[PDB]
Design an enzyme around this catalytic site. Sequence first.
Site, PDB file in Angstrom:
ATOM      1  N   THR A 193       2.333  -0.254  11.726  1.00 17.80           N
ATOM      2  CA  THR A 193       0.908  -0.113  11.447  1.00 17.80           C
ATOM      3  C   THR A 193       0.330  -1.481  11.134  1.00 17.80           C
ATOM      4  OG1 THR A 193       1.541   1.945  10.255  1.00 17.80           O
ATOM      5  CG2 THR A 193      -0.784   1.266  10.165  1.00 17.80           C
ATOM      6  N   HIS A 240       0.819  -1.216   0.000  1.00 17.95           N
ATOM      7  CA  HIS A 240       0.000   0.000   0.000  1.00 17.95           C
ATOM      8  C   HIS A 240       0.855   1.270   0.000  1.00 17.95           C
ATOM      9  CE1 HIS A 240       0.833   1.059   4.137  1.00 17.95           C
ATOM     10  NE2 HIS A 240       0.665  -0.213   4.465  1.00 17.95           N
ATOM     11  N   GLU A 255      -1.781  -7.208   7.954  1.00 14.24           N
ATOM     12  CA  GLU A 255      -0.419  -7.070   8.437  1.00 14.24           C
ATOM     13  C   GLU A 255      -0.210  -7.908   9.699  1.00 14.24           C
ATOM     14  OE1 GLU A 255       2.534  -6.999   7.925  1.00 14.24           O
ATOM     15  OE2 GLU A 255       3.174  -4.910   7.596  1.00 14.24           O
TER      16      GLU A 255
END
Lengths: 262, 260
Positions: free
Chosen positions: B23, B11, B96
């Site tokens: 993140t 991303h 993630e």
Amino acid sequence: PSLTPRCIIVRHGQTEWSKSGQYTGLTDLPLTPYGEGQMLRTGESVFRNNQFLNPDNITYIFTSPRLRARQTVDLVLKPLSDEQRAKIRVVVDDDLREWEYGDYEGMLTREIIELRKSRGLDKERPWNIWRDGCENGETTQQIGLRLSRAIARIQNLHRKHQSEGRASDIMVFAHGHALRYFAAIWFGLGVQKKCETIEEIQNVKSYDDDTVPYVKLESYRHLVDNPCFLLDAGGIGVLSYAHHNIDEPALELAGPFVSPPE
Amino acid sequence: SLTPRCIIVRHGQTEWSKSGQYTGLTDLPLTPYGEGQMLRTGESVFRNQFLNPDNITYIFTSPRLRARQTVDLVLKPLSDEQRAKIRVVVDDDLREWEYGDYEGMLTREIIELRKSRGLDKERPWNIWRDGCENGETTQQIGLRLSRAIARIQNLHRKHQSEGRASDIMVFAHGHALRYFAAIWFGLGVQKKCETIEEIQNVKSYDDDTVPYVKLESYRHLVDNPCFLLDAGGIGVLSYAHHNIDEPALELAGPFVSPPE
């Protein structure tokens, strides 16, 4: 900080044998006409249309002594001016030659398999060049050693350039087995081996360029199995470092691709 | 037919990707810069091609907003008709790494926090080996990524048997995609599926056109694969010798020499 240094690996363009899958080692084939065009287009893409490389950041180009690699250097750099080329050092280094295929020179994989079978080999498991090397050619340890030496010289140049606050892309123009092998050991695949034997410790004088310090290895890396990489003729890969640290060598998954700026 | 490929896309920029803040589950949007970055990326790969819309079969995405926004921006150069021929699947197996206590932290802060807790006295923390406190172990992330890989490779095998090109895209995150690439071409170790969690179907996606592959073993890492992949970066995973049983990493990423 200054841009993290990179090592840009470039496989030579099409030859008569790369097209058929014939193993091309010491045989000094030229590029085909198609291969010449392929490398001209590659240069145009990386420098002109996509600007994946900036000549101002290129410090050194190392090439295999083979004609096909040297032709590829000249064709890829065609978009540059004479002044831009005047600022880039080109070094011919025998440590970057292709795997010496010995008996298997010019053969296809399936032919090598049959020849080995006829000699009583590979009864337990298939031939694996990365483990077994080639009859009357190089062992995997021999190619790992010499590629390790070249890596060490390149990484030493990168460390010096970084210390000067200089960007440093160093290009390596070579061959399909050698470049996949080089990429693999760059980021730590294979095994480490201490340099102990005469061959492991000797300086073979593989290049003549006194601006490139020789690095006497304490240890080297070699593979014992297939690293499972693809790299076409004319293909470009990128090796670099994590965290701006020469002691953290890494493989760039994007190859030369970067997002367009702005 | 063209050898199938799996095209991995990290991303674009977020406020935390910029600063190095970890993140995971935090559902940050792309920054304005990140939006433009992904628009330009799509324009480069399709327009200026490294990808051909006619060969794209499936796009798998992380459920995170930043991944889903990246899908939309990268596909902008397509027509509605081209988009109508591509299936987009949201898959929780592509999220993630769950960072637990370390969410939003920088590496140096994580190291200090761990040090304060009496950890890492013998050797430094290594996420690839150790995972995260109150977050995922390396085995947990390897298992879910293995499940997704198995589904993708199964689709590739089917498409190849139909004589069809098949680029399958995966839009996700920096740790997860580096991990995915590593296990694709055989890094790490194999582990038999034995525990309750190793054998379960977690229902991570809802798309009946994608067969679930029940694993009897999976692959996980125990150390750093030593990869780079910047925000907006594109990698390419494929196969040697047109053989789905020979998965390989494409060193050129998406780059190919311009055709004659």
